[PDB]
Design an enzyme around this catalytic site. Structure first.
Site, short mmCIF file in Angstrom:
data_model
loop_
_atom_site.label_atom_id
_atom_site.label_comp_id
_atom_site.label_asym_id
_atom_site.label_seq_id
_atom_site.Cartn_x
_atom_site.Cartn_y
_atom_site.Cartn_z
N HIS A 141 0.82 -1.21 0.00
CA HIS A 141 0.00 0.00 0.00
C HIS A 141 0.84 1.25 0.00
O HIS A 141 1.30 1.66 1.06
CB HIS A 141 -0.87 0.00 1.24
CG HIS A 141 -1.92 1.08 1.28
ND1 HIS A 141 -3.22 0.82 1.68
CD2 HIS A 141 -1.86 2.41 1.03
CE1 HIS A 141 -3.91 1.95 1.66
NE2 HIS A 141 -3.11 2.93 1.27
N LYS A 171 -9.03 0.03 -6.22
CA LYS A 171 -9.15 0.65 -4.90
C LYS A 171 -10.49 1.36 -4.70
O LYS A 171 -10.92 2.12 -5.54
CB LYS A 171 -8.02 1.67 -4.70
CG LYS A 171 -7.99 2.41 -3.38
CD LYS A 171 -7.76 1.44 -2.18
CE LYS A 171 -7.52 2.15 -0.88
NZ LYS A 171 -6.37 3.08 -1.02
N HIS A 208 1.66 5.42 -1.63
CA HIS A 208 1.35 6.61 -2.41
C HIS A 208 2.65 7.22 -2.85
O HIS A 208 3.49 7.55 -2.03
CB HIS A 208 0.54 7.62 -1.61
CG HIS A 208 -0.75 7.07 -1.14
ND1 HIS A 208 -1.91 7.19 -1.88
CD2 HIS A 208 -1.08 6.36 -0.03
CE1 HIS A 208 -2.88 6.55 -1.25
NE2 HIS A 208 -2.41 6.06 -0.13
N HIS A 253 -4.96 -0.83 5.74
CA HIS A 253 -4.57 -0.08 6.91
C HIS A 253 -5.61 -0.19 8.02
O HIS A 253 -6.20 0.81 8.40
CB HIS A 253 -4.26 1.39 6.61
CG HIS A 253 -5.22 2.12 5.72
ND1 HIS A 253 -6.59 2.12 5.90
CD2 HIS A 253 -4.98 2.98 4.70
CE1 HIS A 253 -7.16 2.86 4.96
NE2 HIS A 253 -6.20 3.41 4.23
N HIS A 299 -10.47 1.11 1.50
CA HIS A 299 -10.30 2.06 2.58
C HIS A 299 -11.65 2.05 3.32
O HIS A 299 -12.60 2.74 2.90
CB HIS A 299 -10.00 3.44 2.04
CG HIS A 299 -9.78 4.44 3.13
ND1 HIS A 299 -8.61 5.15 3.28
CD2 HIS A 299 -10.58 4.81 4.15
CE1 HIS A 299 -8.72 5.96 4.34
NE2 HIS A 299 -9.90 5.75 4.90
ZN LIG Z 1 -6.59 4.76 2.78
ZN LIG Z 2 -3.50 5.03 1.28
#
Ligand SMILES: [Zn+2]
Ligand SMILES: [Zn+2]
Ligand SMILES: [Zn+2]
Ligand SMILES: [Zn+2]
EC number: 3.5.2.3
Lengths: 343, 337
Positions: free
Chosen positions: A13, A99, A15, A174, A136
């Site tokens: 995961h 996602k 960014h 997460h 998420h």
């Molecule tokens: Zn997230």
């Molecule tokens: Zn993220």
């Protein structure tokens, strides 16, 4: 000095942002991890094969000479996304996963999802072709207390979705609560989770006692200690459907240390040794390699890396900041002395 | 159009700081409030009559000519404070009250200061309490509630005649505790703890200017506080906890706690009472309940609020840096006429 040798890890995961910030932050990932799941939340988001191909090449352009790093691309799910576009990208090896960000009725159909019900055709397509869904898992409704957002997602969205689409493979990204740790522990072979270093190392007190610490502000928000302990216990148990996902989420210093600080920790430089510190503290180093280098590949049906890296238990100081073109980035644990670093 | 006239208010919980900051912030209080309880958490703290007398003059030096403002001084309680120092300052009219800050120079236990507290009870000096426990492993959102059980209730059972203000209450736990207490227990409430809850500080960004102590709580706590003030219960009164810090001490890697709310607090309280359909209780909160609890006369002048939208300044100039007021750049519904 003690040495910890592991198969080369991956980051499930990440960014990487874009433009100059991407050029700055890529090396911190490519120097250590073989592969990373690269999240699609650019502005505008990555919702087409063409954009993902272009973005992949921008990432590859920024990898320093000699680093063996492969970015694994994702599609941002939106109401307007054509299921055929998603399928084409998966079939062409461009999209490794898709996602799902929190739903909101007011979101533009070009930028996200109004509700899960509205994107059943794409989700059904993912179930069909065996494409993993990365979630998420927070609900966004204004009345809902921020600390309850993850737990409420489990009841309201995740369980009904998984009951609806029984063959869909899902990563609960997460996770930050006992509620999630238990849900994932008690789940089936089609449900996994990632955990960040900050959610293992810290709880909401470290963000809010004696000062407000925006470099510890991230989503989902740090929870009370009982949740942190549940997460630590989950990774320490050897449970094999939890794996490394840093959620390294960089923002320039001036965007973090403002009157409205952005969420996200820039933890790529220090995550792996932080993980090592946690597993050691939990008397569970025997399970550290799997978390870093085996569980993720197994869940995604990809090979385990065949090269090795070494951590060494020798104290190093984390940089205070890392220079960008215009501003600076403050790394996770900036200025601190850390217990484990990469050799 | 709508005008609300009230007896001139007082601020029963204020931080004026010192030096250039003091010079900048005092006029925002002195232009409106007749009196204020001036907290003693300077660096170093005000723990003696001499220090209190000097600080009071620095405060008066900074009050514009034409403002009728009286600072009411406080003693910072410490483990080793001489009860004679406190009492002398009370008898000389220097100390109006004494303030208990749980350590983290603050007090490390009620037991270490019992001779001081017994003297305060004897002489009729009110104790002002920052009611949070501080043990490291106690979750920040629980610290006020835990304090009630572990410190407040046993203290008030031991000294049954001690007058106590539970400062800046932030929880339903504190609201019910105070509502069900006796005539020797009161509380102050800030505008931020009526207007906002923790979501306002944390959702869509972290907002250091809403970061203060005790920390904003969950919405149910906020609503309990709004219902308490709106009920007309007469042992809650205005205390801003205006607690100013320079902009870049708030907007940093480790932001200081405190809202600089003196400029905007009175109007913000007006909005809250209006919203609760309780403007009939506004004057008493602002201008009567505090005086009654402290045994002081009510002010004999009046001020007017007007329901005409004004913008709050984005910042206020300091010698070094700027000061961001509470609700900076925001529109506010009521302002002082
Ligand atoms: Zn997230
Ligand atoms: Zn993220
Ligand atoms: Zn206080
Ligand atoms: Zn205060």
């Amino acid at each position: 000095s003690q040495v910890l040798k592991i198969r080369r890890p991956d980051d499930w995961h990440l960014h990487l942002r874009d433009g100059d910030m991407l050029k700055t932050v890529v090396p911190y990932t490519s120097e250590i991890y073989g592969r990373a799941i690269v999240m699609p939340n650019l502005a505008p988001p990555v919702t087409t094969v063409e954009a993902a191909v272009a973005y992949r090449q921008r990432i590859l352009d920024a990898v320093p000479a000699g680093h063996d790093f492969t970015p694994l691309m994702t599609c941002y799910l939106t109401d307007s996304l054509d299921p055929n576009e998603l399928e084409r990208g998966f079939n062409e090896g461009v999209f490794t996963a898709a996602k799902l960000y929190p739903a909101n009725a007011t979101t533009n159909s070009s930028h996200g999802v109004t509700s899960v019900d509205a994107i059943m055709p794409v989700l059904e397509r993912m179930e069909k072709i065996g494409m993993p869904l990365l979630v998420h898992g927070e609900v966004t409704h204004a009345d809902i207390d921020i600390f309850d957002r993850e737990a409420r997602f489990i009841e309201s969205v995740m369980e009904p979705l998984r009951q609806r689409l029984t063959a869909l493979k899902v990563v609960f990204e997460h996770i930050t609560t006992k509620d999630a740790a238990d849900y994932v522990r008690d789940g089936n072979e089609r449900l996994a989770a990632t955990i960040t270093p900050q959610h293992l190392m810290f709880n909401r007190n470290h963000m809010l006692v004696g000062g407000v610490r925006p470099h510890l502000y991230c989503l989902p928000i740090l929870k009370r200690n009982i949740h942190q302990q549940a997460l630590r216990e989950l990774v320490a148990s050897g449970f094999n459907r939890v794996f490394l996902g840093t959620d390294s989420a960089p923002h320039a210093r001036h965007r973090k240390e403002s009157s409205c600080g952005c969420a996200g920790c820039f933890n790529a430089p220090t995550a792996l040794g932080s993980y090592a510190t946690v597993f050691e503290e939990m008397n569970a180093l025997q399970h550290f390699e799997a978390f870093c280098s085996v569980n993720g590949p197994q869940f995604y049906g990809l090979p385990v890396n065949d090269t090795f890296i070494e951590l060494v238990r020798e104290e190093q100081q984390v940089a205070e900041s890392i220079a960008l073109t215009d501003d600076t980035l403050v790394p996770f644990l900036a200025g601190e002395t850390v217990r484990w670093s990469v050799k």
